Ligand binder design. Sequence first.
Ligand SMILES: CC(=O)SCCNC(=O)CCNC(=O)[C@H](O)C(C)(C)COP(=O)(O)OP(=O)(O)OC[C@H]1O[C@@H](n2cnc3c(N)ncnc32)[C@H](O)[C@@H]1OP(=O)(O)O
Ligand SMILES: CC(=O)SCCNC(=O)CCNC(=O)[C@H](O)C(C)(C)COP(=O)(O)OP(=O)(O)OC[C@H]1O[C@@H](n2cnc3c(N)ncnc32)[C@H](O)[C@@H]1OP(=O)(O)O
Lengths: 158, 165
Amino acid sequence: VTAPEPLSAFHQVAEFVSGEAVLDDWLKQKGLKNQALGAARTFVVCKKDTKQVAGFYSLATGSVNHTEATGNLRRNMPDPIPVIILARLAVDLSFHGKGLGADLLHDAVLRCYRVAENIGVRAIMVHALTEEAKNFFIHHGFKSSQTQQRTLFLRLPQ
Amino acid sequence: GPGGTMGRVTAPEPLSAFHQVAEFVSGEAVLDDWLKQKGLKNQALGAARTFVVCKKDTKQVAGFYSLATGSVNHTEATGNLRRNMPDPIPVIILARLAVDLSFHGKGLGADLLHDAVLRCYRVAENIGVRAIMVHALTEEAKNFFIHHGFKSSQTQQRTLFLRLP
Ligand SMILES: CC(=O)SCCNC(=O)CCNC(=O)[C@H](O)C(C)(C)COP(=O)(O)OP(=O)(O)OC[C@H]1O[C@@H](n2cnc3c(N)ncnc32)[C@H](O)[C@@H]1OP(=O)(O)O
Ligand SMILES: CC(=O)SCCNC(=O)CCNC(=O)[C@H](O)C(C)(C)COP(=O)(O)OP(=O)(O)OC[C@H]1O[C@@H](n2cnc3c(N)ncnc32)[C@H](O)[C@@H]1OP(=O)(O)O
């Protein structure tokens, strides 16, 4: 695949299938529209020598109240806690099991660290859609909320 | 205007341990004390990023502002801010803004706000952001933001927004 780049009208998305239709349909129907609105910024990777999207993720600003956080995350912090929402992350079924999911997450993390140089950010927050998704994030260092087991956080040490 | 001094200040730069803040006074003690007690600590925690301007040829702070990520529910927004948007709406919070009493009335409050706005537009290239949000501490502060293009929430006059796209 190609290096991560911003979603554009040059990207072919209509055939993308990840196994989660809510994510597939968001990419195809709302991805580019929501970029113009300031609702989310989407980054894609493409099959080599094509503009066919092989995987993507989306980032938006956000916050979390102390009750949905963890004991360590809320320590000595204001309420609510400033976060970046990793709103969506998916790889096409044809590319599963090749480390592209991990690679996309790593790119997202680095981009959040860069954003955090100019704006206050405590953590990356994700809402896991399934138990399998939650376990993927746990494997990569995310920690669950105490009240919602599918809300997870990755503290950005600074 | 001339304000209280005709000395200059430096360009905005990140708060650091090299900055003197202990003598800063803005007319609002809550802001003065946040800067002195929490400014640098909160930077390391990821609670807020603070940018300062200093008296020329010193490291003495003459003004500052602070930025953090945040969001707002549709009920607390405006119709134009929320139309076709997810709920809640992604924003950047202008958490703190203050100038030392000695430099009031010189356009430094406007200059700091302008630098804050440009910094938000740069951030927005990498992350979804709909608007800058501010909670005005006083009536005087609210009117200052209105003069520079911010719009009040319909329910709360002291919560104001500046749309970016
Ligand atoms: C993002 C949200 O908002 S929540 C929804 C999450 N997204 C989805 O569920 C959409 C459908 N699923 C997918 O798109 C993919 O399965 C992804 C993106 C979750 C993972 O990508 P994949 O290609 O399957 O995994 P990839 O090959 O990158 O695996 C990377 C590492 O994670 C591990 N891993 C992958 N899936 C899981 C899992 N469910 N549980 C634990 N570990 C996992 C792999 O074993 C590998 O580990 P290693 O480096 O120690 O060998
Ligand atoms: C950010 C928050 O969360 S709210 C808290 C805001 N901060 C504070 O209250 C701390 C105490 N006050 C201050 O530090 C300062 O008064 C500031 C930073 C708010 C403003 O800075 P000042 O030095 O007073 O104003 P500055 O000289 O930059 O004024 C710039 C312009 O705005 C105008 N202006 C200033 N105050 C007001 C006001 N209250 N109402 C309308 N217009 C105003 C000025 O006349 C000038 O207009 P122009 O550019 O058309 O000539």
